[PDB]
Design a protein around this ligand. Sequence first.
Ligand SMILES: [Mg+2]
Ligand SMILES: [Mg+2]
Ligand code: NA
Ligand code: NA
Lengths: 195, 195
Amino acid sequence: GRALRVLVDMDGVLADVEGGLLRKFRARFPDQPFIALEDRRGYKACEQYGRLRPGLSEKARSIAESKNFFFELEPLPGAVEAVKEMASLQNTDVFICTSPHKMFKYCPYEKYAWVEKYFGPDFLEQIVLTRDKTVVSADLLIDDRPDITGAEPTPSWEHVLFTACHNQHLQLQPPRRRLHSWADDWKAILDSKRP
Amino acid sequence: GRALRVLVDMDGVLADVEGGLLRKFRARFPDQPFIALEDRRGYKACEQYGRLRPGLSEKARSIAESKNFFFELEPLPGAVEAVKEMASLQNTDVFICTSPHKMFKYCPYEKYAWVEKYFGPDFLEQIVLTRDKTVVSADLLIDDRPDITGAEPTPSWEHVLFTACHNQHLQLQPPRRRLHSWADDWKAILDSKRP
Ligand SMILES: [Mg+2]
Ligand SMILES: [Mg+2]
Ligand code: NA
Ligand code: NA
């Protein structure tokens, strides 16, 4: 007491939503152009697909809306190991703070199931499902979305940007910070917020 | 700006979880003793069922864990009308802040579906699913659970206790407040927190 509280985003931070989208898009729509991971720009993949060719945004969306899309995402390298270690640290509380998106039949269930699979049943109590992360209080939010907005104009967390291909070239306004991958020094970031 | 932010609990505040539990329990287990609504005491119904007769807690739990339990709950009188009005007020942001419980196959989906049904698709973005309400920041939390605890020792909200049969006889520690039903003067409660 007090415990440092860290919110960890799920999509693109713990679960490889980009790789999953691209793989399943390519398999389901093999004759359509696609966006190679390195060429991704901007948080919303479907929007970029729409610019590639008309109709592709809805097809990209249909991949993400399909049963087992979220459940079958691969963990990002080091993600499960890092979050387990982080949660186990003294004076450190970790919550997985993630959006259900505009899709509720499968996505919430599958996100819970995915967390159960990789972190165990006891970690389910650490999940906060919300479209608005600004109303969740914490010391840190690790999330791959550059612009996080919502009902709270002054969120209590510092947003640390987790690198993803869609944001990796972005110049952030100082003093905004990055976590480059789970191999990067996340302990140093947490420690900088401690008493 | 700033908008007053109000968290409204779902079970026992918007949706009649007590009536639904009792009705479906009685229908599925007609030869078992039950707990009449007026005799409910303590937030956790299944725990009281367990004291009534051994094995009854697991049966009560099975009712709540069954498909369509949450979806088929009836709204409490005045609840949908009040929350719609509250959300429509100037400088007032409403979030439905509710637990998925220890059950994730049906409960999250059904809670989203229930909100869609009674409040419309656009209200889905106001849902926060969490087992820990203390990490959700707001001015007010209207919730029928007397004791709300979690990772944040000093939540930012004032907890206003929504009357339910299990809490109606409880003497609260001053200056804790109650909302007796949605017929009660909820506007006065909100107004007391405004600048
Ligand atoms: Mg993300
Ligand atoms: Mg409740
Ligand atoms: Na879905
Ligand atoms: Na369930």
